[PDB]
Amino acid sequence: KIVNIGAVLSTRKHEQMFREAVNQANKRHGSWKIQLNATSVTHKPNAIQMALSVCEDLISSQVYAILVSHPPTPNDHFTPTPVSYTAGFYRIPVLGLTTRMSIYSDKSIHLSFLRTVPPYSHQSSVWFEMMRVYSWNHIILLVSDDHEGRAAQKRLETLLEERESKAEKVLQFDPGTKNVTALLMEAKELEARVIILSASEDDAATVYRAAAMLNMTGSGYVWLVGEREISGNALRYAPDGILGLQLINGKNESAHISDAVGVVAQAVHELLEKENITDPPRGCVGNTNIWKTGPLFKRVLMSSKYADGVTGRVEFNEDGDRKFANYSIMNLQNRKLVQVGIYNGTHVIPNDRKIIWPGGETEKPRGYQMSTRLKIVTIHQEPFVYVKPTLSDGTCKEEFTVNGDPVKKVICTGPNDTSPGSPRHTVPQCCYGFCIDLLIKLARTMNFTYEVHLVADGKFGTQERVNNSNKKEWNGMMGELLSGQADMIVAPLTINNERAQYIEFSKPFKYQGLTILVKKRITGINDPRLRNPSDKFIYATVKQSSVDIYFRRQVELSTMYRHMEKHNYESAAEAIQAVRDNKLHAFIWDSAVLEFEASQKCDLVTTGELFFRSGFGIGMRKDSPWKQNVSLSILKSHENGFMEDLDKTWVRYQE
Amino acid sequence: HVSWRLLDVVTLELGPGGPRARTQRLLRQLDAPVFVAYCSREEAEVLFAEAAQAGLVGPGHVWLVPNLALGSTDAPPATFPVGLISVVTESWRLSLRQKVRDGVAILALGAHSYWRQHGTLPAPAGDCRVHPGPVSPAREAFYRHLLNVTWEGRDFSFSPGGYLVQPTMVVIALNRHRLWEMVGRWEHGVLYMKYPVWPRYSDSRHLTVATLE
Amino acid sequence: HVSWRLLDVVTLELGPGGPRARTQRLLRQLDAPVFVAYCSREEAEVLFAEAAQAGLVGPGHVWLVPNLALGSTDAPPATFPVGLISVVTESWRLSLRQKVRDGVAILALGAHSYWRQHGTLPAPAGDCRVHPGPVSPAREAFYRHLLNVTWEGRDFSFSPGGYLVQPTMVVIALNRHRLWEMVGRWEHGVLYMKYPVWPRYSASLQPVVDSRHLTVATLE
Ligand SMILES: *[C@@H]1O[C@H](CO)[C@@H](O[C@@H]2O[C@H](CO)[C@@H](O)[C@H](O)[C@H]2NC(C)=O)[C@H](O)[C@H]1NC(C)=O
Ligand SMILES: *[C@@H]1O[C@H](CO)[C@@H](O[C@@H]2O[C@H](CO)[C@@H](O)[C@H](O)[C@H]2NC(C)=O)[C@H](O)[C@H]1NC(C)=O
Ligand SMILES: *[C@@H]1O[C@H](CO)[C@@H](O)[C@H](O)[C@H]1NC(C)=O
Ligand SMILES: *[C@@H]1O[C@H](CO)[C@@H](O)[C@H](O)[C@H]1NC(C)=O
Ligand SMILES: *[C@@H]1O[C@H](CO)[C@@H](O)[C@H](O)[C@H]1NC(C)=O
C-alpha cells in the first residue's frame, strides 16, 4: 500500500536528508505491504500564508503525520503554532524536531502534538537531583511571570511537596523589567544562600548586573541556572562558577529527523493491521469533519518504542516529552565553559575534573549562613518567667539567695505594661526565673547572643480562621515565629499535633499534664455536674490557648465546650485571683503552674491528679539548622543533673 | 467549612464501543448517594447507558454534571437520567437575535464610553498580507476600556483572563417531561431554590422517617 | 479465614489456532499484583509469550501455576517468567529405578501385611481372552488391605479414589538462573519458607526492595 507522510523544514538542504532518511527507512520494509513517500514545504515571513500553505500541503496528499522544524528566524515561540492549530482541527498527529516552549504540552489547547526533545520545564528534576546529591536544603527560587516560569516553579514545587519540604522563599519579577534592586534586596535578608534562576537572556543579564552591584555574587553563595540563561549577551558578563546544564546533542536538527522517521514508520506498520482503516482526511475545504482514527493513531504512536536511536532509546511521556534525554553539567572556569559531569536525568555521574565555586574555594559550600544575633519571644508565666520593673540607675535591683550566688536577670522589652488601655507605648523591663536561666545555659553552651522581648497580645497562640476569608493565620506568640518576628521560643510551650504541623520542636525538658485547682463535691471530668451546665459549679480556662483546642477537639463533649464559649478569661494569675474571690469554682490548666502556686502561697488544693499528659519544649522554625544541637544540649543537661539542681532551686524551695 | 467526606474518585476510558469492559467493572463496585461526573456530550451517552445497566439511575441516586455536557439544551437526548442537576450562565433561553443585539450593544457601549472621554475612535490594523503590528501603541486603553462597561443592569465585568467574572447563573434539571426548567438563581452570592425539598420524582434507597418532640 | 478479595476471572482461547488480537486486548486490560493461571504446556508457552508482549512479566506481578503445566521439570523453555511458583510432590528429583524400587516395596509390604492376617498371596485371574468375573470377595479383601502403607518416613496412604491423601508436598520456583529450586516444604498442614520475604527480580537481574517496606528489630 502507498503510505504517505509529510514534513515542514526551512533548510532546503536537510530536506534532502529527510528524503534520504525516509528512503533508508523504506529499505527496512519495502515489500509493498506498505510503501512510503515524502513531501516538504518551507517557512515564510507571514503566518497566515504559512497556515494556508500547510493547508495546501495537507490536501496535496493523504498525509499521515507532520514534521516541523525551527527556521533561521529568531521568534522561536509562535513558529510551530500555525501548523499545529490548523492540523489540530483534523487531529493529524505532528512531531516537533526542535522546540522547547512549555505551552505545547497543554494537551487541552494543542489537541494533537508530540515532541522529541524535553521542554525547558524538565530541568527541575535535574536541579532536584543535584540538591539531593550536594545536600542543600534551604533554597531560594527566583522566577519570571511568563507561563514558562510558572510551569517550572509548579513542577519544582510538586517535587518538593512530594517530599514535604517546601521552599524557603519564592519571589517573581514581571518580564521585561529593569532596575529591580528591590527583589534581590528582599532575597538578601535570609539565611538561605542558594538561588535558582530561570528567565530570558536579557533578563538574565539585567539580574546579573544588579546582583554584581549588590555584592551578592561573591563567596559563600552558589546559584545554578538553566540553559536559556548562559547564552547570548547574558553569557557575556556573569560571575565565575555559575553551574549550568546543556542538552545531549540538541540543535543538531538532523539527528532527530532519523529518529522521527523511524518511530513514524514503526507506528504506521502497527496501525495498518487494525480493522478501522479510516484513511486520513483529503481536502482543506468543505470537509468539516475529523479523522475517524486520529486518537487511535496518536495512542499507538505514543506507546511505540525504538531500539537503537542516534540520540538513544526513544520513549514518550504522558504528553510526548522526550523521556530520558541526556544532560551535561557545566561551569564557568574563568570566562570559558567546561563539561564537568553527565547526568541521565535519573542520576548524576561526575566524570570530569574538579569544580570551582564563585569564591574560588575548593571545599563544597554549605547553605544557611548561620546568623549570630537571634531574637527571642516569651510570655509571662509565674513559675518560669518573672517580669519586674527596673530601677532608675538602669538595672533592676539585685537579689541574692540563700545559696550564696545571685539570681540571673536580663532586660526584656515590648509590652505597654497596661494591656486594657494603651494608645501606644513600649517600655523596658527585667525578666528572670527558670526559662531565663535555661536560656543562659543554652547560649553559653552554643556561642550565641540574644535580645529577648515580649509578645504583643498576651495569649499563648492558637490557630484560627477569621471571617470573610479562607486562610487561617496563627495569632499571638505562635504567629510571631511563623511570620518572621522571632527566631526561637524559650517559654512553657506545649507540644500538640497542630503546632507540630507547621513548626518543629526540640526534645522535651519537663513533663506534666492537666489538672484542677480548688479553694480549700469536686473531682475529675466524669460528673454530671460537670458534663451538664449548672450554676452551682462553674469551670473556665484561658482563651486562645491549647485547652480550648483540646475541648473543641471532641464532638461528644460539645455542650461542655459550649459552656466554655459562654465566658472565659484572657488572663493570667488574674484567673487564680478570680478563683480566690469566690467568683470561679475551679480551674483547669497545666500541672506545674498550679502545683507551684498551690504549695507556695496557701489555702489552695489540687484536685486528684493528671489525666492528659504532655511535655514542654522549645519552638523553632521548620527545618532550621539548630534543632539537633539544641536537643543534644537538652539531653546532656538531663544527664548531668543540672536540670535537677535547677529544679530544686526554683520549684522545690516551697512547702 | 463542612466536613465534605468523599468516597472515591474514578478515571474511566469510554469511547467507541470496542474498549468498554474495564470501565464496567470499575463502575460496578462503587456506591454513593451523590455522583459528580466529568465527560463530554459525545460520552455521556455511553456513561449513562452503562450506568443504567449496573443499577445507578433509580430515584435513590442523584447526579450533577457541569455545563460542558448537554450541549444541545434545546432537545435533550434519551438515556439521560430523569432529574440531573447542572448549572448554566444567564441568558440560556435568549434568542439568537437577542444575543447578537447584546454583542453589538457591549461593543458600542465600550466605544461610546471612550467617546465620552473625547479621545478618538481608533482604527483597526491594516490587513493580513503585511504581518503588521509589532508593538502595542496607545491603543491599549481601548481594550481596557472594553471591560467594566455594563448594560441594562447586567454586570459584564471581564477578567484579565478573557472570561466574565461574577455573573448571574442559574441551576437547571430534567423534570418528568424531558425539558429543562429553572430551579434557582445565584444573584449576589445567595442561593435561591424553587423546591424546599428535592422531589425525587419518577430495590431502592432513601427512605423517609417521622418523629416528634 | 481472610476474605480473599477476588478481582477478575478470564477464560481465553489459547489453542494452536485462533485470533491473537482478541486475547491481546483482553490481557492488556488488567491490573492485579497476583495472577493464578491454569493451562497446559503449549498453552502455557503461548500465554506467557503473549503476556511478555503485553507488559505483565516485569518485577511487579507474580504468577502461580498447578503441576499440570511446567512440563518436564528438567528443561524450562523460554518466555517462562523468573519467579514462577508451583507445588510438586515429594520425589520430584529421584531416579526412575528408585521409583520402581519404591513401587515394588509398596507391593511387597502390602502382600506381607496380607500374610500377617490370612497367610497367602491370592492366585491370579488373567483370562484376558475369556474376560470372566463377577464381584470377587478374595481380591476385594486383598485390595482393601492394599490401600494403606508406610515406608521409613514416607507414608503412601491411598484414598478410595485412587489418589494418595496427606502427602508431603514441596513448593518450587524458578531461580534467577533458569533452574528449578525448592522454596518451601509442607508437612502436616504447616507451611515453611526459605525466605522471610519474596525475593523480587528485575530485567537486568539486580533484585529490588519495595519502597513501602522495611525491616524492624527488637528483643524481649
Ligand atoms: C509523493 O511525493 C511527491 C513529492 O514529495 C509528490 O509530488 C508532488 O506533487 C505536487 C502536487 O501538487 C506537486 O506540486 C509537486 O511539485 C510534486 N513534487 C515532486 C517532487 O514531484 C507526489 O504527488 C507524492 N505521491 C502521491 C501519490 O501523491
Ligand atoms: C474601567 O477600567 C479602567 C481601567 O482599565 C478605568 O480606568 C481608566 O484607565 C485608563 C488607563 O489608560 C485611564 O487613562 C482612564 O482615565 C481611566 N478611567 C477613565 C475613564 O478616565 C476606568 O475608569 C474604569 N471605568 C469604570 C466603569 O469605572
Ligand atoms: C549531528 O549529529 C551527527 C551524528 O551524530 C554528527 O555527525 C554531527 O556532527 C552533529 N552535528 C551536526 C551539525 O550535524
Ligand atoms: C552543632 O554542633 C557541632 C558540635 O556539637 C558543631 O560542630 C556545629 O557547627 C554546630 N552547628 C550549628 C549550626 O551550630
Ligand atoms: C491398615 O493398616 C493396618 C495397620 O497395620 C492394617 O492392619 C490394615 O490391614 C490396613 N488396611 C485396612 C483396610 O485396615
mmCIF file of all heavy atoms in Angstrom, chain B residues 113 117 140-141 144-145 147-149, ligand 2, unseen atoms left out:
data_model
loop_
_atom_site.group_PDB
_atom_site.id
_atom_site.type_symbol
_atom_site.label_atom_id
_atom_site.label_comp_id
_atom_site.label_asym_id
_atom_site.label_seq_id
_atom_site.Cartn_x
_atom_site.Cartn_y
_atom_site.Cartn_z
ATOM 1 N N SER B 113 -18.240 54.763 25.491
ATOM 2 C CA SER B 113 -17.645 55.051 26.788
ATOM 3 C C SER B 113 -16.300 55.736 26.624
ATOM 4 O O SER B 113 -15.951 56.631 27.402
ATOM 5 C CB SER B 113 -17.501 53.762 27.596
ATOM 6 O OG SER B 113 -16.468 53.874 28.560
ATOM 7 N N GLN B 117 -14.875 60.451 26.633
ATOM 8 C CA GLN B 117 -13.516 60.896 27.029
ATOM 9 C C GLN B 117 -12.956 61.796 25.933
ATOM 10 O O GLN B 117 -11.926 62.447 26.135
ATOM 11 C CB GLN B 117 -12.641 59.671 27.188
ATOM 12 C CG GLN B 117 -12.632 59.203 28.615
ATOM 13 C CD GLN B 117 -11.824 60.201 29.388
ATOM 14 O OE1 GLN B 117 -11.022 60.936 28.822
ATOM 15 N NE2 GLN B 117 -12.023 60.214 30.692
ATOM 16 N N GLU B 140 -3.850 50.456 23.562
ATOM 17 C CA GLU B 140 -4.068 49.533 24.671
ATOM 18 C C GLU B 140 -5.141 50.011 25.638
ATOM 19 O O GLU B 140 -5.697 49.185 26.371
ATOM 20 C CB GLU B 140 -2.758 49.309 25.429
ATOM 21 N N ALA B 141 -5.439 51.311 25.669
ATOM 22 C CA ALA B 141 -6.535 51.795 26.501
ATOM 23 C C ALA B 141 -7.872 51.234 26.034
ATOM 24 O O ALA B 141 -8.691 50.806 26.858
ATOM 25 C CB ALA B 141 -6.564 53.322 26.498
ATOM 26 N N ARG B 144 -8.735 47.915 27.371
ATOM 27 C CA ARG B 144 -9.015 48.077 28.794
ATOM 28 C C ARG B 144 -10.385 48.707 29.004
ATOM 29 O O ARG B 144 -11.209 48.199 29.777
ATOM 30 C CB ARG B 144 -7.919 48.922 29.445
ATOM 31 C CG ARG B 144 -7.813 48.763 30.950
ATOM 32 C CD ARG B 144 -6.415 49.109 31.442
ATOM 33 N NE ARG B 144 -5.444 48.074 31.105
ATOM 34 C CZ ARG B 144 -4.133 48.263 31.058
ATOM 35 N NH1 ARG B 144 -3.594 49.444 31.318
ATOM 36 N NH2 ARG B 144 -3.341 47.243 30.741
ATOM 37 N N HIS B 145 -10.678 49.776 28.258
ATOM 38 C CA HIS B 145 -11.961 50.449 28.414
ATOM 39 C C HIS B 145 -13.110 49.559 27.967
ATOM 40 O O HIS B 145 -14.279 49.886 28.203
ATOM 41 C CB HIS B 145 -11.962 51.767 27.639
ATOM 42 C CG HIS B 145 -11.742 52.972 28.500
ATOM 43 N ND1 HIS B 145 -12.606 53.330 29.512
ATOM 44 C CD2 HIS B 145 -10.754 53.898 28.506
ATOM 45 C CE1 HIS B 145 -12.163 54.426 30.100
ATOM 46 N NE2 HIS B 145 -11.039 54.790 29.510
ATOM 47 N N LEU B 147 -13.752 46.698 29.227
ATOM 48 C CA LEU B 147 -14.006 45.654 30.263
ATOM 49 C C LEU B 147 -15.199 45.937 31.194
ATOM 50 O O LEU B 147 -16.185 45.181 31.116
ATOM 51 C CB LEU B 147 -12.722 45.418 31.066
ATOM 52 C CG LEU B 147 -11.563 44.820 30.268
ATOM 53 C CD1 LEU B 147 -10.493 44.269 31.198
ATOM 54 C CD2 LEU B 147 -12.060 43.733 29.330
ATOM 55 N N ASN B 148 -15.114 46.969 32.041
ATOM 56 C CA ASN B 148 -16.130 47.268 33.098
ATOM 57 C C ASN B 148 -17.549 47.573 32.585
ATOM 58 O O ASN B 148 -18.505 47.233 33.307
ATOM 59 C CB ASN B 148 -15.634 48.331 34.084
ATOM 60 C CG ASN B 148 -14.721 49.362 33.455
ATOM 61 O OD1 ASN B 148 -14.952 49.806 32.332
ATOM 62 N ND2 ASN B 148 -13.681 49.749 34.178
ATOM 63 N N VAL B 149 -17.674 48.245 31.440
ATOM 64 C CA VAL B 149 -18.962 48.677 30.805
ATOM 65 C C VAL B 149 -20.115 47.680 31.018
ATOM 66 O O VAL B 149 -19.995 46.531 30.551
ATOM 67 C CB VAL B 149 -18.763 48.943 29.301
ATOM 68 C CG1 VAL B 149 -18.513 47.651 28.540
ATOM 69 C CG2 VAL B 149 -19.944 49.692 28.703
HETATM 70 C C1 LIG D 2 -12.734 50.742 33.733
HETATM 71 O O1 LIG D 2 -11.397 50.296 33.989
HETATM 72 C C2 LIG D 2 -10.382 51.229 33.604
HETATM 73 C C3 LIG D 2 -9.003 50.625 33.837
HETATM 74 O O2 LIG D 2 -8.750 49.620 32.848
HETATM 75 C C4 LIG D 2 -10.581 52.511 34.409
HETATM 76 O O3 LIG D 2 -9.501 53.464 34.357
HETATM 77 C C5 LIG D 2 -9.170 54.054 33.084
HETATM 78 O O4 LIG D 2 -7.809 53.679 32.836
HETATM 79 C C6 LIG D 2 -7.163 54.357 31.756
HETATM 80 C C7 LIG D 2 -5.756 53.798 31.583
HETATM 81 O O5 LIG D 2 -5.289 54.061 30.256
HETATM 82 C C8 LIG D 2 -7.146 55.853 32.066
HETATM 83 O O6 LIG D 2 -6.352 56.648 31.161
HETATM 84 C C9 LIG D 2 -8.561 56.368 32.283
HETATM 85 O O7 LIG D 2 -8.507 57.736 32.691
HETATM 86 C C10 LIG D 2 -9.184 55.549 33.403
HETATM 87 N N1 LIG D 2 -10.554 55.974 33.615
HETATM 88 C C11 LIG D 2 -11.094 56.996 32.956
HETATM 89 C C12 LIG D 2 -12.412 56.717 32.301
HETATM 90 O O8 LIG D 2 -10.557 58.089 32.886
HETATM 91 C C13 LIG D 2 -11.962 53.096 34.152
HETATM 92 O O9 LIG D 2 -12.159 54.261 34.954
HETATM 93 C C14 LIG D 2 -12.968 52.023 34.535
HETATM 94 N N2 LIG D 2 -14.319 52.516 34.352
HETATM 95 C C15 LIG D 2 -15.238 52.368 35.302
HETATM 96 C C16 LIG D 2 -16.571 51.855 34.841
HETATM 97 O O10 LIG D 2 -15.010 52.625 36.473
#
